Design a binder for this molecule. Structure first.
Ligand SMILES: CC(=O)N[C@@H]1[C@@H](O)[C@H](O[C@@H]2O[C@H](CO[C@H]3O[C@H](CO)[C@@H](O)[C@H](O)[C@@H]3O)[C@@H](O)[C@H](O[C@H]3O[C@H](CO)[C@@H](O)[C@H](O)[C@@H]3O[C@@H]3O[C@H](CO)[C@@H](O)[C@H](O)[C@H]3NC(C)=O)[C@@H]2O)[C@@H](CO)O[C@H]1O
Ligand SMILES: CC(=O)N[C@@H]1[C@@H](O)[C@H](O[C@@H]2O[C@H](CO[C@H]3O[C@H](CO)[C@@H](O)[C@H](O)[C@@H]3O)[C@@H](O)[C@H](O[C@H]3O[C@H](CO)[C@@H](O)[C@H](O)[C@@H]3O[C@@H]3O[C@H](CO)[C@@H](O)[C@H](O)[C@H]3NC(C)=O)[C@@H]2O)[C@@H](CO)O[C@H]1O
Ligand code: NAG
Ligand code: NAG
Lengths: 354, 323
């Protein structure tokens, strides 16, 4: 009997992440057929909240007409319960990718917590004399790097480039890709509205850059507002939930990698808000329905019952026959939030494009 | 190192045991469980997956795929299965995981057709242990018997979803094609066993008329395509582990046939339909037992060799112990 291996957990997780990102095993699809991603592709950034991921999977199972829509789950943490919940999805194409620069893969070194890093609340005069690595590079508020807060911005930018230029099933994909999170709940007609939203964009809003499936403001009655969409300037605090990008819109973002990776803000949506006023050629105008088709559920069983009660009471207003645009200038980030002053985070973020 | 990466994948996936197409938050394995031994011939695996997709009423039957070779094309074929619960386990002592060492091809192993007097002077590892025909160990011929015996113990005592499973488990291979009514007949075969053949030990999907089944003395070489065992029938096999792992025959079915005539407490009687429901590449209303052969003798099968290396003996016996 062969001598067993030394149980290195971090080496085992890297092996799973590296192999699955290369194989790219596609679920519920017979590749020997003529299936290709079309119109819409869902990309979900997953963390470690299985109670909210299950709510998202329940909304997808109750959704209508998504039997051919590819749903990509981008993971930054390997978890048996997380992989088990997604494995139960058999009603639509499912793909799993793993962020290969997660803190779980690097415990004792960047992008994790290097033992020579400066503490968070250590003053600069003490850090310079101590001699820690990033002593000369704090953020705009004198705070130093924390690995747990920088991973989300790294993952969002890596998964944006990965699904557009590293996923072989999305080669030459000329549709839209919807970006949501694990703590989101999609309406049963979110795909029905998106198909009419994109047709309404190609006919009445040629200047619309991106699409959104709704804001955080929802009315108790969907009467008269369920078939209406608004054309507004993209605000990160109001349109960070369910963002649909195009191939042309993605190329404008990847051309702004240096500006995205150096902006001192660990929030990806606040950084995109700065892109509109700086590196992007113009600010973004978003197409969003007056009634949201996506909800932020963040107890799980309590907020889920309120969403399903809101959608059931207004079941008559969903799935509208026709959408109509109803009757706005740019907006700058009011304040940098810091957390992205370490140049090591800058260089790692810039390398995703290469 | 690719082989070192595969070892890491196998250890994690055999422990996690991710169950597909099942919402664990009220499904439990019942009646029948399918266990398929997969190697590295996707052209035949696709035929088996086409037969499963065309089968009737197997939406609740768990199909476990035991792999001895990691392949992107192989893993992609099974991921497309969305119509029944799917589980993937990996044989952790395969040649892909150990290329340059046992159970693979150790660089110090003796050649196949090297005489024993030359092997003793050369000093190769297994020089003192050739098979019954003067031939030495070949890794490619020992993997099938190693995988079959490990997979028998793993699905019965190491799969958490099959804990306290009080049903039957069907064992087939990647090069098999199931009839669309194989599960329809099995459900009536087990009902027909509980009513007209209390002495039937195991069931078979084939070796006449479409509604007739026969009761014969169980020969392993005649029922190696789609073999359904019970927990009591499984326990009889593991109690004969030393005889299975030391018998000089790399074929698992020839070894099981020798197990019946030399180690089993009593002979087995098998229920098999006259028309096979499995093929090596309908839907009757009622099944009726036709031919009922009495228990007759069975001669010791001629050994084919290929299982004389004691290293294969110890590894085969250790599967029940390793944890
Ligand atoms: C409606 C509106 O415009 N609200 C603004 C409000 O969001 C700002 O608060 C800051 O929010 C960001 C992240 O915002 C995301 O999440 C919100 C949740 O509601 C969303 O609404 C929003 O769309 C975004 O998705 C936080 O990161 C900021 O936190 C930092 O600053 C606060 C100050 O109280 C501090 O308490 C936090 O601990 C954090 O401080 C930073 O922490 C990191 C890591 O520990 C350090 O590296 C970094 O140096 C710290 N910086 C500072 C300055 O201490 C806010 O909560 C609000 C402020 O801009 O404006 C409202 O208008
Ligand atoms: C129609 C019929 O029933 N034919 C039987 C015939 O197949 C048997 O021959 C041996 O079959 C086994 C495998 O048996 C399985 O597959 C059969 C179909 O091919 C099924 O019919 C059967 O039910 C089983 O499912 C083979 O492994 C044997 O191959 C060995 O022996 C032959 C002949 O001597 C030799 O040419 C082969 O090369 C092989 O020899 C061994 O090879 C290994 C690996 O290199 C060596 O380690 C070992 O030392 C070699 N031993 C010998 C003796 O050379 C046969 O093909 C037949 C049994 O004799 O019964 C017929 O009824
Ligand atoms: C485990 O693996 C990681 C990365 O492969 C390595 O840095 C670490 O030293 C290993 N731990 C050991 C060998 O104990
Ligand atoms: C990987 O390591 C194994 C030993 O564990 C060794 O036999 C094999 O040759 C290595 N792979 C390569 C490509 O050398």
């Amino acid at each position: 009997v062969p001598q067993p291996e030394a149980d290195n957990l971090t080496l085992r997780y890297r092996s799973l992440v590296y192999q699955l990102n290369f194989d790219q095993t596609l679920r519920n699809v017979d590749k020997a057929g003529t299936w290709a991603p079309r119109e819409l592709v869902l990309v979900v950034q997953v963390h470690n909240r299985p109670e909210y991921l299950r709510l998202l999977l329940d909304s997808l199972r109750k959704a209508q007409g998504i039997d051919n829509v590819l749903v990509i789950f981008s993971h930054d943490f390997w978890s048996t319960e997380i992989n088990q919940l997604i494995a139960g999805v058999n009603f639509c194409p499912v793909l799993q990718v793993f962020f290969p620069f997660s803190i779980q893969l690097y415990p004792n070194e960047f992008p994790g917590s290097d033992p020579r890093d400066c503490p968070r609340d250590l003053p600069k005069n003490a850090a310079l004399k101590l001699g820690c690595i990033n002593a000369e590079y704090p953020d705009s508020f004198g705070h130093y790097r924390e690995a747990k807060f920088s991973q989300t911005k790294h993952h969002w930018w890596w998964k944006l480039h990965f699904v557009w230029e590293r996923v072989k099933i999305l080669r030459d994909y000329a549709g839209l890709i919807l970006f949501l999170e694990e703590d989101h709940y999609l309406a049963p007609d979110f795909y029905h509205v998106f198909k009419k939203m994109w047709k309404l964009k190609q006919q009445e809003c040629p200047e619309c850059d991106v699409l959104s499936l709704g804001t955080y403001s929802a009315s108790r009655s969907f009467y008269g507002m369920a078939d209406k969409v608004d054309v507004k300037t993209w605000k990160s605090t109001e349109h960070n939930m369910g963002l649909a990008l195009t191939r042309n819109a993605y190329q404008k973002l990847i051309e702004c990698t240096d500006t995205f990776c150096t902006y001192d803000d660990y929030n990806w949506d606040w950084t995109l808000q700065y892109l509109t006023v700086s590196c992007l050629p113009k600010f973004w105008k978003v197409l969003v329905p007056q009634i949201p088709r996506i909800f932020h559920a963040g107890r799980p069983s309590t907020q889920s019952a309120q969403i399903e009660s809101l959608l059931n009471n207004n079941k008559q207003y969903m799935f509208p026959e026709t959408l109509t645009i109803s009757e706005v200038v740019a907006i700058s980030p009011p304040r940098k939030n810091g957390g992205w002053g370490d140049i090591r985070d800058h260089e790692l973020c810039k390398s995703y494009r290469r």
